[PDB]
Amino acid sequence: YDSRWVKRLDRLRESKFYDPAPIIKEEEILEADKIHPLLKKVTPSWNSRRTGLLAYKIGMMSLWDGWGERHAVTVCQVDRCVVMDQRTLDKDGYEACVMGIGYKPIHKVTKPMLGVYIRSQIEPKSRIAEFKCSSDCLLPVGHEMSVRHFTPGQQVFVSGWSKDKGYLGVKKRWGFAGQNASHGVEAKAHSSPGSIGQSKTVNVVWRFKKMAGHAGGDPRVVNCKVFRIEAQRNLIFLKGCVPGYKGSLIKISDARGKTHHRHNRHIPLHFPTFVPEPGVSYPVTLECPDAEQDPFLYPEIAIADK
Amino acid sequence: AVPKGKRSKHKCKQRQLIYFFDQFDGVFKRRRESFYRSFYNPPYFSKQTEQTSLPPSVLRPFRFPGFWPGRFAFKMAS
Amino acid sequence: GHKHSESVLQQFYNRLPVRKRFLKAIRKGTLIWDKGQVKIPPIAMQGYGLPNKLVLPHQKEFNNKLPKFKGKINQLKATRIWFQD
Amino acid sequence: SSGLPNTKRRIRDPFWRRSGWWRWRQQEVKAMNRSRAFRRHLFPRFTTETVSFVDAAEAEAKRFKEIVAETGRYPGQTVNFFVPKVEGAKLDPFAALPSRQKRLKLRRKAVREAEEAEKAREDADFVWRGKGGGRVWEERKANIPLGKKKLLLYCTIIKGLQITDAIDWLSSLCLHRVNYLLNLLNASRKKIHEQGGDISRVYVESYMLNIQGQIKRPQFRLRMVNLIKTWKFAVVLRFREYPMDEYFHKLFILKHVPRSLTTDMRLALAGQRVGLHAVRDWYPFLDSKTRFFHRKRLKWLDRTRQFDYCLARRVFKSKYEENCRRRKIQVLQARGASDAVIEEAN
Amino acid sequence: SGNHWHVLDGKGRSVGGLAAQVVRLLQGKHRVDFTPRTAAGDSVIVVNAIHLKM
Amino acid sequence: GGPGRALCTPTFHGLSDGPYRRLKFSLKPIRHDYRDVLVSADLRKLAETAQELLRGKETKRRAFWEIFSKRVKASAHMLSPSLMALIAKSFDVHDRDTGIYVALATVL
Amino acid sequence: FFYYRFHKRIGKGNFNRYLEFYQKPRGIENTLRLRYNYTPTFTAKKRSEMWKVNLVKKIAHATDAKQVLDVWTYYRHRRTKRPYHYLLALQRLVEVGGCDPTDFR
RNA sequence: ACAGGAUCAAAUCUUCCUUGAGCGACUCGACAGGCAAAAAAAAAAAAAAA
RNA sequence: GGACUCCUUAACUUAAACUGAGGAGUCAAGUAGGUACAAACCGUACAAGGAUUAAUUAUGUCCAA
RNA sequence: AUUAACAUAACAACAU
RNA sequence: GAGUCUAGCUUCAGUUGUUAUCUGAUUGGUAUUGCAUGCCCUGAGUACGUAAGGAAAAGGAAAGGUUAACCGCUAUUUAAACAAAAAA
RNA sequence: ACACAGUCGGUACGAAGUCGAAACAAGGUAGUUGAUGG
RNA sequence: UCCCUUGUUAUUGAACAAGAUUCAGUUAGGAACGAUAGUUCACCGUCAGAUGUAAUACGUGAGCUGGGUGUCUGGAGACAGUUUGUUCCCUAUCUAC
RNA sequence: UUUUUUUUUUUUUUUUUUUUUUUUUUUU
RNA sequence: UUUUUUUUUUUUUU
RNA sequence: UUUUUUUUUUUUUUU
C-alpha cells in the first residue's frame, strides 16, 4: 500500500532478498499419517469418470527432452487442494465432490464461513470449486490431492479465464481491414467500420454484430500435455499455453471425445487416485517418454511436374 | 442529426432527478466528507490575507451550548 | 425474408407448420395439403373413372358409369398412371 | 486516490436496479419500507388530553370570505353589495384582512403567549400535541445569477436539514455562485438569533423559486447572429422552530440527530475537553452503533413495561433548560455584575 | 376457501378435445356468476398425458 | 375490425343498484380469548357454570342445557374426579337426565 | 402487477421407453409465486382474510390432539403467522393430554 | 438429534418404526458493509490498539 | 369532358389499375353491421335527439366469440 | 400596476 | 434475517434412433469414433487388364490457410540505472 | 398503461354471532345427513 | 443436392484408373493472384486453392470514392459495451378516555 | 522491464464452459 | 409383419 | 359412399 515510486523501487530490489533453493531428494517414502483410511482401489467401468484439479499459473519455461528438442511448458502448482464435502442422489440429488484451494487471512473471513472451516478441520480457503464425476469415484472427505493423479504423457483439458485489455476499437478487437492511408481518403474513414446493415428492406441490425467494446475477460479452454511432475513441491509442467494471469485459477481435467479416443486409449491411469502402499518408496520426478522415430530426420520428397 | 420532435415535461422531470442523483453520488458526497475531516486539524491561515484577517486560532467553538457541560466562563479577578 | 413481394401460392406454403423435408415435397408436388393433413395426391388411371370429388357437378353422372378399381397398387394393371391436377 | 476518484464507486439509480425495479416490485418494496418506518415510533401508554394546533388568522380569513361569498355583502353591510376588483382599480377589496407576514407575526405572538400560559397548568406533563406547532420565519434573496437547474440541486440538498448543517453543506462545495445562498443563510441565522429564538432547534422546511428576467447579448457567427443571455432567479426560504416536545421525540426516539452536533461531541471527546462522565451521557447520540443499540434496549424496555415516556421527556427538558440557564448565569457573572443585577436579570 | 379442484384422466383421449374441455373449466364460463374481468375458474389436474392420441 | 364479431362482446354490468356497492373492507379487532364461549368452553368455564347453576335457582332455557350437555359429553375424557362430582351434582340438583350419567360411568 | 410473466419451458428429460411405475413424482411442476393483476372484490378479500379468526375459532373448538393437528395442517399455506398462534396451539395441545412429538404435523 | 416410541429385548458399534425431503447443503445470530483516505489492468495485499 | 363493379364490345400480347363506347347500382356527397387488416362488394323498416326492450338478414352454430 | 403561454411551491388521495 | 457453494431453467446446428432368451465352479458377458479440401508413405506394383496402364478398408506427416490464446525462444520498438555493514 | 394518452362498464355491510336451530324425518350427537346397484 | 469432400454394391456403350445424367441430409469443413483500364465477354501468362451462380433500393454514400457509355456537433427504434442495494440523500406523527 | 506479429501453442467439450434468480408465498 | 432399411429386401393381402 | 370448406387469422380435426 505504498506509493508508486516506492513500489517501483521494491520491484527492482526484491531480487536481493531471495531465500536459498531447497534440497530436492531422489526418493520418497510415505507413512500411515498421510493416507486416508477410507481410501481403497476400485475397478473402473464403462460409465465411470474421474475428478478434476485446480491450479495456479506461475509462468512459462523452456525445457529440452531425450531427443534434444526444446519445448515451451507452463508451470502449475496445486496449492493444497483438499476435498470438503460430497454430494449424493439421496441427500442432494446429484453426485459431485467439492474441493478447496488457497489461503486467506483470518482477519478477512466472515463468521459463517469460519463455521464451515471449523467443521472441516482445515485452514481458511481462498476458492472453492465442484466437480461432477461418477458415483464410483467419490473421494473421501479430507483427502489431499497430489500431482500423481495425472500420468506423464497424457492429454489434459484445461479451462480458464482470458486477460483483460480494456476498451478497444473495431480495428483493434476484431481486426478490421479499414481504408487506405492515401488516395483521397477522409480522416474518419481511416479506421471506420463501413457498412453495418442493409437498406430499408431490413430496418433492424442482426444480433451478435461485430462492434467496438471492452475486450478480454472470457472463458477459454485448451488441450495440454503432461511433460513433467514434481512430488516434493507439487508441481506440474504442461506443454502448450494456458490463459489467465500469472496466478489466476485454472481447472484441469481429462480428455474428452476425440482427444480421448485418439490419445488417451493405451495409457494406464489410476482411476480413483494415487494409492501408495505403506513400506514402499516412490519416485519424486517423472519425465515424459521419448518418441519412437528420430525427430531430426529429413527424408526425401519427390517433386515431379506433370 | 436533428431532433424529430419535442420533449415532454415528464422526461425533463425524470432527467432532473437522474442528474441530481448522479451529481450527489460523486461530487457533493465526496466534498462533504473531505470538508468534515479538516475539523480535527487547526484552521487554515493565509499570509496574504494577514492585512485584514483575524489572528490565528486552534480551539474550535461549540455550536450547541445546550449539550455543553462544564464551566462556560471564568469569574473576574479582584 | 429479404424478398419484398412474394406470390400468394408461395406464401401459403410458407405458413405450413411442417418439417423442411415435407415442405420440399409439397413444393415439388409429390405431396399435397388438405384438411390440415399431408397425403399422396390422387392417382389418375387410364380408362378407369376418377373420384367423384374432383369432377364437376354435371360430370358426376357420367363419371359414375365408368369402370372403377377395387384392388391394390400391386394388383393394378393400368397402362399409364399419373397424379390428377 | 491522489488526484483521481475511485474507479470502483457505486452510483445509485432511482429508476433501475440490477435485481429488478419494476412497477410490481416497487409496490412491495414501498410497502415493506412503510411498514418498517411506522414501527420505529414509541408512543406513550397513558395520556390525559390531546391538544391540536390551529391558526386563528387563517380561520378568520376563511370566515370573512365565506360570508362575502354566500351573502354578497360585507360584515355589517345592509345597504350595499360587494364590489370585486376591476382592471385599473387601485383599491384592494380585501384590504381589511392582514397579509402573510402579519399573520406570521400574529402566530409568533400567539405561540409565545401559549408557551407562557403553559406553566400554569398542573397536568402539562401528560398532554399530547403531535406535530405542527412552532414559530415560523420567512426570508427572501433576489438578484441571483443562477437558473432553475442549478438552483434545484442545492435546494434539494439543503431541504429538510438543520440550519447549521445546511451552511456546512454549501460551504463544502467550494463554489462561487453559492455565496449568494450562503449569505442568505447566515443573515437568516443571525436575524433568528437576534429575535430570541433558539437556533439549535430551527430547521429548513421548504423553498421557493421565482423567475425575474433575462439579459440578452449579441453573438455573431459565420452565417448567423446568436443571442447569449443570463439567468436571474430569486430564492425564498422558510424556517420553523421545533418545540421541546417535538425535539425530544426526534432525537431520543427517532434518533435523527444532526451531524454537526455529533461531530462537535466527538471533537470534544477526542481533544479531552470533557471528563469521563460525558461519554456515557452522550452515548445515546454519540455514534450510529450506540444509537442502534440504545434504540433496541429502549424497545426491549418498552415491551417489558419498564420505560416511562413522560419521565424521560421531563428529564430531557429539565437538563436542556438547566444547561441553557447556567450558560446565561455564567455569562452575566463574567462581567462582574452585582448580586442585585444578577437577581433582576434572572 | 372457494377453490375447487378437478382431477381428470387423459388416457386415450384426444388432445384437441381435452384442451377444449379444459378451456371451459379454466375460464369458468360453466358457472352462472361468470365475470370476464376476473378468473372465475377452478384448478384442473391432468394425468397420463403420455397416452394421448393424434 | 377483426375475424370475429365486434358487437358479440358481453361486458359485466350490475342489473340493480344499492348503497353497499362501495363499502370498504377492514379487519376489526379479533377476540383474544375465544374459550370464553360456551360452545368452545373449557374445564374452567365448565366449573364456573356448574357453580353458578348450584348457586342460583333460575330456570334456564333448553338451549343452555343442550349445549352444556353436548360440551361435557365431548370433553368427558378431560375431567378430573373432583370436577366430575361438581358437574354431576349440578345435573342432580336441577333434575336433568340427558344420558350424561351413562357417559361419565365409562371414565369415572 | 401490470405484467405477470409465466412460461413453461421444455425441460430436459428422458421419456422414451418409459416404464409405468405406480409412484409419485419428485414435486409439482409449477412453483412460481402466483400474483394477481387485478384488485380483489369484497368477497374475495373477506375469504382471504377470514383465516385469522377461523384458525383460533377452530383451535378453541377442537377437543383432541388429532383435531388440533388437523386444524393446524389445514391452514398450512397461510402466511404471516404471529407468535401467539403457536402459544395457543401449544396450550391446547398440553391441555388435551399431550401429543406426538414425532408427528409430521 | 440416536431426539421419541413398541417388544418374554439387538456382538463389541440400535432388531424394528416415526422425523412428508430433520427447512436444497454447511454455517452464523454484536450476523452482514455502502461511502472516504491510500492503493489499484481482472484479481490480490492492512488484527486491534487518535 | 369521373374512380370501381355487372352485360355487350373496339384496341392490345383474347396481356395491364391502361385507351375509348352503349345502360343499371354504389362511392363521390353514407354512419354504424358482415367480408381478418384502408371509399367501390352484401344488407339496411339506412345516423333530429335520450333510456339496461321485442324482431329471420348478409350470415353463423368445437375453442378464442 | 397588469391576461395567457411559461417557472416553482403547499395541501388534498388507500379496494391496496 | 445474512455469507459461500449449488439443484431446476436458459445456451451455435439438430435428433428420439439403446437392454427377449440369460456361462451350472470350465480366467467371462456391446462401451468417449456424428466430421468431409489438396499432395506423399505402408497396404501395392496387389485386385483388374493382351499390353500400356493402375483401386479400397486403417493409420501415420510435411506445407498452405482460418479462429482463439500467450510472452518460454527469435525480430521491431522502448524504459529503468537508489537503502547487505546496529562503527554506517 | 399493450392504447394518437380517450369512452362504456366497474366491487353488494351483518353469522367476525352462538345460553341456537322445537313443533319435517333420520341421527354413527357431527347445529351431522336426503339423488344414484352399470 | 450450389465448385470439391458423402450415399460400401446393379441408371450406364461402369474391365482398373480417370469420367457423364438424376435423386436424397439431422445443412458438417473449405476454395490464391497479376498486366492492359475498351463500362464485359471469347481468349491470353503464374500458384494448379484445381470447369468456382443469384436475391438483398448499384445490398451498403447523414462509412469512404473515381479521367462521365454540396453539407450536417446523433433527440426516439435497432444493434455492440455497462448497471451494489431491503437500508446506508431528504421525508414518511398510532390508538382516543 | 512492458506492448506487438514477423514468434509459439490449440483446433477439443455443447445435458460442455458460464451465469444477474431457491420457487408449497393464491391478493408486500 | 421382422431395427430388414443411404438408390438393397422377405413374409402375409390387412 | 357421406357429413369437413380457400378452416388460407390462430388452436383443433376431437367422426
JSON list of N, CA and C in Angstrom, two decimals, chain A residues 218-244:
[
{"chain": "A", "resi": 218, "resn": "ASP", "atom": "N", "xyz": [-13.10, -13.47, -20.87]},
{"chain": "A", "resi": 218, "resn": "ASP", "atom": "CA", "xyz": [-13.91, -14.50, -21.37]},
{"chain": "A", "resi": 218, "resn": "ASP", "atom": "C", "xyz": [-13.39, -15.87, -21.01]},
{"chain": "A", "resi": 219, "resn": "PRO", "atom": "N", "xyz": [-14.24, -16.88, -20.87]},
{"chain": "A", "resi": 219, "resn": "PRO", "atom": "CA", "xyz": [-13.78, -18.23, -20.65]},
{"chain": "A", "resi": 219, "resn": "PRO", "atom": "C", "xyz": [-13.17, -18.87, -21.87]},
{"chain": "A", "resi": 220, "resn": "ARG", "atom": "N", "xyz": [-12.09, -19.61, -21.71]},
{"chain": "A", "resi": 220, "resn": "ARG", "atom": "CA", "xyz": [-11.42, -20.31, -22.80]},
{"chain": "A", "resi": 220, "resn": "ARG", "atom": "C", "xyz": [-10.86, -21.62, -22.28]},
{"chain": "A", "resi": 221, "resn": "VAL", "atom": "N", "xyz": [-10.83, -22.62, -23.12]},
{"chain": "A", "resi": 221, "resn": "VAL", "atom": "CA", "xyz": [-10.40, -23.96, -22.94]},
{"chain": "A", "resi": 221, "resn": "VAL", "atom": "C", "xyz": [-9.36, -24.35, -23.94]},
{"chain": "A", "resi": 222, "resn": "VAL", "atom": "N", "xyz": [-8.48, -25.25, -23.64]},
{"chain": "A", "resi": 222, "resn": "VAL", "atom": "CA", "xyz": [-7.38, -25.69, -24.41]},
{"chain": "A", "resi": 222, "resn": "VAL", "atom": "C", "xyz": [-6.87, -27.04, -24.00]},
{"chain": "A", "resi": 223, "resn": "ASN", "atom": "N", "xyz": [-6.31, -27.82, -24.86]},
{"chain": "A", "resi": 223, "resn": "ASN", "atom": "CA", "xyz": [-5.66, -29.05, -24.65]},
{"chain": "A", "resi": 223, "resn": "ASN", "atom": "C", "xyz": [-4.21, -28.87, -24.26]},
{"chain": "A", "resi": 224, "resn": "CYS", "atom": "N", "xyz": [-3.67, -29.66, -23.40]},
{"chain": "A", "resi": 224, "resn": "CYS", "atom": "CA", "xyz": [-2.36, -29.68, -22.88]},
{"chain": "A", "resi": 224, "resn": "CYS", "atom": "C", "xyz": [-1.81, -31.07, -22.76]},
{"chain": "A", "resi": 225, "resn": "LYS", "atom": "N", "xyz": [-0.53, -31.25, -22.63]},
{"chain": "A", "resi": 225, "resn": "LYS", "atom": "CA", "xyz": [0.21, -32.44, -22.46]},
{"chain": "A", "resi": 225, "resn": "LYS", "atom": "C", "xyz": [1.04, -32.43, -21.21]},
{"chain": "A", "resi": 226, "resn": "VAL", "atom": "N", "xyz": [0.98, -33.40, -20.36]},
{"chain": "A", "resi": 226, "resn": "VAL", "atom": "CA", "xyz": [1.73, -33.59, -19.18]},
{"chain": "A", "resi": 226, "resn": "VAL", "atom": "C", "xyz": [3.16, -33.89, -19.54]},
{"chain": "A", "resi": 227, "resn": "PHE", "atom": "N", "xyz": [4.09, -32.97, -19.29]},
{"chain": "A", "resi": 227, "resn": "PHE", "atom": "CA", "xyz": [5.50, -33.15, -19.62]},
{"chain": "A", "resi": 227, "resn": "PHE", "atom": "C", "xyz": [6.34, -33.63, -18.44]},
{"chain": "A", "resi": 228, "resn": "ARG", "atom": "N", "xyz": [6.18, -33.01, -17.27]},
{"chain": "A", "resi": 228, "resn": "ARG", "atom": "CA", "xyz": [6.92, -33.37, -16.07]},
{"chain": "A", "resi": 228, "resn": "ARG", "atom": "C", "xyz": [6.10, -32.99, -14.85]},
{"chain": "A", "resi": 229, "resn": "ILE", "atom": "N", "xyz": [6.28, -33.70, -13.77]},
{"chain": "A", "resi": 229, "resn": "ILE", "atom": "CA", "xyz": [5.68, -33.57, -12.50]},
{"chain": "A", "resi": 229, "resn": "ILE", "atom": "C", "xyz": [6.68, -33.64, -11.38]},
{"chain": "A", "resi": 230, "resn": "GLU", "atom": "N", "xyz": [6.46, -33.01, -10.27]},
{"chain": "A", "resi": 230, "resn": "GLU", "atom": "CA", "xyz": [7.20, -32.97, -9.07]},
{"chain": "A", "resi": 230, "resn": "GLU", "atom": "C", "xyz": [6.38, -33.29, -7.86]},
{"chain": "A", "resi": 231, "resn": "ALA", "atom": "N", "xyz": [6.69, -34.26, -7.07]},
{"chain": "A", "resi": 231, "resn": "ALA", "atom": "CA", "xyz": [6.05, -34.69, -5.89]},
{"chain": "A", "resi": 231, "resn": "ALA", "atom": "C", "xyz": [6.39, -33.88, -4.67]},
{"chain": "A", "resi": 232, "resn": "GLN", "atom": "N", "xyz": [7.60, -33.46, -4.51]},
{"chain": "A", "resi": 232, "resn": "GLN", "atom": "CA", "xyz": [8.13, -32.70, -3.45]},
{"chain": "A", "resi": 232, "resn": "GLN", "atom": "C", "xyz": [7.41, -31.39, -3.27]},
{"chain": "A", "resi": 233, "resn": "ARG", "atom": "N", "xyz": [7.44, -30.55, -4.25]},
{"chain": "A", "resi": 233, "resn": "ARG", "atom": "CA", "xyz": [6.86, -29.27, -4.37]},
{"chain": "A", "resi": 233, "resn": "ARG", "atom": "C", "xyz": [5.49, -29.24, -4.99]},
{"chain": "A", "resi": 234, "resn": "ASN", "atom": "N", "xyz": [4.96, -30.33, -5.45]},
{"chain": "A", "resi": 234, "resn": "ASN", "atom": "CA", "xyz": [3.68, -30.42, -6.04]},
{"chain": "A", "resi": 234, "resn": "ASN", "atom": "C", "xyz": [3.58, -29.54, -7.25]},
{"chain": "A", "resi": 235, "resn": "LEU", "atom": "N", "xyz": [4.34, -29.74, -8.28]},
{"chain": "A", "resi": 235, "resn": "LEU", "atom": "CA", "xyz": [4.45, -29.01, -9.49]},
{"chain": "A", "resi": 235, "resn": "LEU", "atom": "C", "xyz": [4.14, -29.85, -10.69]},
{"chain": "A", "resi": 236, "resn": "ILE", "atom": "N", "xyz": [3.53, -29.32, -11.71]},
{"chain": "A", "resi": 236, "resn": "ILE", "atom": "CA", "xyz": [3.17, -29.89, -12.95]},
{"chain": "A", "resi": 236, "resn": "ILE", "atom": "C", "xyz": [3.58, -29.03, -14.11]},
{"chain": "A", "resi": 237, "resn": "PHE", "atom": "N", "xyz": [4.21, -29.58, -15.14]},
{"chain": "A", "resi": 237, "resn": "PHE", "atom": "CA", "xyz": [4.62, -28.87, -16.34]},
{"chain": "A", "resi": 237, "resn": "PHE", "atom": "C", "xyz": [3.73, -29.33, -17.48]},
{"chain": "A", "resi": 238, "resn": "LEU", "atom": "N", "xyz": [2.99, -28.42, -18.07]},
{"chain": "A", "resi": 238, "resn": "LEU", "atom": "CA", "xyz": [2.06, -28.57, -19.13]},
{"chain": "A", "resi": 238, "resn": "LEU", "atom": "C", "xyz": [2.56, -28.01, -20.43]},
{"chain": "A", "resi": 239, "resn": "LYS", "atom": "N", "xyz": [2.62, -28.75, -21.49]},
{"chain": "A", "resi": 239, "resn": "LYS", "atom": "CA", "xyz": [3.03, -28.42, -22.80]},
{"chain": "A", "resi": 239, "resn": "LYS", "atom": "C", "xyz": [1.95, -27.65, -23.52]},
{"chain": "A", "resi": 240, "resn": "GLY", "atom": "N", "xyz": [2.25, -26.44, -24.00]},
{"chain": "A", "resi": 240, "resn": "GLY", "atom": "CA", "xyz": [1.28, -25.62, -24.72]},
{"chain": "A", "resi": 240, "resn": "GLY", "atom": "C", "xyz": [1.17, -24.23, -24.13]},
{"chain": "A", "resi": 241, "resn": "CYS", "atom": "N", "xyz": [-0.06, -23.76, -23.91]},
{"chain": "A", "resi": 241, "resn": "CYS", "atom": "CA", "xyz": [-0.32, -22.45, -23.34]},
{"chain": "A", "resi": 241, "resn": "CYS", "atom": "C", "xyz": [-1.61, -22.51, -22.53]},
{"chain": "A", "resi": 242, "resn": "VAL", "atom": "N", "xyz": [-1.66, -21.74, -21.45]},
{"chain": "A", "resi": 242, "resn": "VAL", "atom": "CA", "xyz": [-2.82, -21.66, -20.57]},
{"chain": "A", "resi": 242, "resn": "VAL", "atom": "C", "xyz": [-3.22, -20.21, -20.43]},
{"chain": "A", "resi": 243, "resn": "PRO", "atom": "N", "xyz": [-4.49, -19.85, -20.64]},
{"chain": "A", "resi": 243, "resn": "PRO", "atom": "CA", "xyz": [-4.92, -18.46, -20.49]},
{"chain": "A", "resi": 243, "resn": "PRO", "atom": "C", "xyz": [-4.92, -18.02, -19.03]},
{"chain": "A", "resi": 244, "resn": "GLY", "atom": "N", "xyz": [-5.15, -16.74, -18.83]},
{"chain": "A", "resi": 244, "resn": "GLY", "atom": "CA", "xyz": [-5.21, -16.14, -17.50]},
{"chain": "A", "resi": 244, "resn": "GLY", "atom": "C", "xyz": [-3.89, -15.53, -17.07]}
]
